[PDB]
């Protein structure tokens, strides 16, 4: 049966404005494994995003971790957008600027 992806977005180091950092988008609990993940800066696709190999958990659902260098500032927003067969439209989750 299809399972819908869950998306969490969080920072590797304390987010401090102007300070280079790493933003993660962890995508979990989905099936089937085919999925398209983009990270967004001001609503536009960030080009160099790196992805972990897909893997799966004890319950058999898949997960993957995306990450990108970023420098937060108070003029930029960040998000993670996912397309999967389980959803009619892509799902976007914005970074809450704190995680």
């Amino acid at each position: 049966i299809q399972k819908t992806p869950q998306i969490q977005v969080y920072s590797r180091h304390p987010p401090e404005n102007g300070k280079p950092n790493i933003l993660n988008c962890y995508v979990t609990q989905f099936h089937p494994p085919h999925i398209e993940i983009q990270m967004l800066k001001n609503g536009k696709k960030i080009p160099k995003v790196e992805m972990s190999d897909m893997s799966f958990s004890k319950d058999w659902s898949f997960y993957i971790l995306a990450h990108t260098e970023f420098t937060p500032t108070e003029t930029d927003t960040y998000a993670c957008r996912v397309k999967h067969a389980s959803m009619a439209e892509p799902k976007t989750v914005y970074w809450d600027r704190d995680m």
């Binding site: 920072s11 085919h34 790196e50 972990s52 190999d53 897909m54």
Partner: protein, 268 residues
């Protein structure tokens, strides 16, 4: 305890397209990947070959090489024979490996899921369907059990090759497996104070909101989320009556810190 898990994910889109990819973990550290696109199994650590010689690794890899092609043909032939009762697409996953414990004791496992659901395991000397699995699997599993050679190979792989190989991985990877990485923490927010803790390894950790010496009971631990550099991230949140955040602190205890806990005071 360390659990070594070989995770295979095979997708059959139709009669002309399939792919099989694998990843291998020892505990929470990845040790191999094996892309469909690749003839050979890739190393993700300098110690991924464990204590096996190049010759012995080649032999083990050869067996998997034969298995990967054999498995793909077996599934495609099964779908042909069942046609059109079993439609493409088909997703098969396999989780196989062993759990290593004190002394030199270990338990092995080999579980298979079909369309996301556990359906078959190897146990003892045979493949079996699990109760609840679709009845059309009974016949192909009976036929696979008549393959004595495959049964003997799997019993060797589970009962012998696995724990032996992993003993070698534990010795060769000792300094990575026993690594200590220190957490850093930060705070954010009638409301919810959040203590974020990131960068620690290994996974066990204690994070609690405190008022002085007293643990705040209402502290809720989040999920452990992985960072991309083999460390962990966790938040713990506490709902607090507005105006009464003064005097609160987040405390973090972790093996990497010694007994020097991190204490982060709110509002300060």
């Amino acid at each position: 305890n360390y659990t070594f898990r070989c995770l295979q994910m095979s997708s059959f889109a139709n009669r002309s397209w399939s792919r099989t990819d694998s990843v291998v973990w020892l505990g929470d550290l990845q040790t191999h990947r094996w892309s469909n696109d690749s003839a050979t199994i890739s190393f993700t650590k300098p110690w991924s070959q464990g204590k096996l010689s190049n010759q012995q690794w080649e032999k083990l890899q050869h067996m998997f090489q034969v298995y990967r092609v054999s498995f793909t043909r077996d599934i495609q032939e099964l779908v042909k024979m069942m046609s059109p009762k079993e439609d493409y697409p088909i997703e098969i996953q396999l989780s196989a490996g062993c759990e290593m414990y004190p002394g030199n004791a270990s338990e092995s496992f080999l579980h298979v899921a079909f369309q996301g659901k556990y359906v078959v395991r190897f146990w003892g000397t045979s493949w079996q369907t699990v109760p609840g699995a679709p009845s059309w699997l009974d016949l192909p599993i009976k036929v696979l059990n008549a393959d004595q050679g495959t049964s003997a190979t799997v019993q060797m792989l589970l009962n012998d090759t696995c724990p032996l190989f992993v003993r070698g991985l534990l010795e060769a990877g000792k300094s990575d497996l026993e690594k200590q990485e220190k957490p850093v923490a930060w705070l954010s927010s009638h409301r919810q104070l959040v203590c974020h803790v990131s960068g620690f390894y290994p996974k066990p950790v204690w994070v609690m909101w405190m008022r002085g010496d007293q643990e705040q009971q209402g502290t809720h631990r989040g999920d452990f989320l992985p960072n991309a550099d083999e460390t962990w991230y966790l938040q713990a949140t506490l709902d607090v009556e507005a105006g009464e955040e003064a005097g609160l602190a987040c405390r973090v205890k972790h093996s990497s810190l010694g007994g020097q806990d991190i204490i982060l005071y709110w509002g300060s």
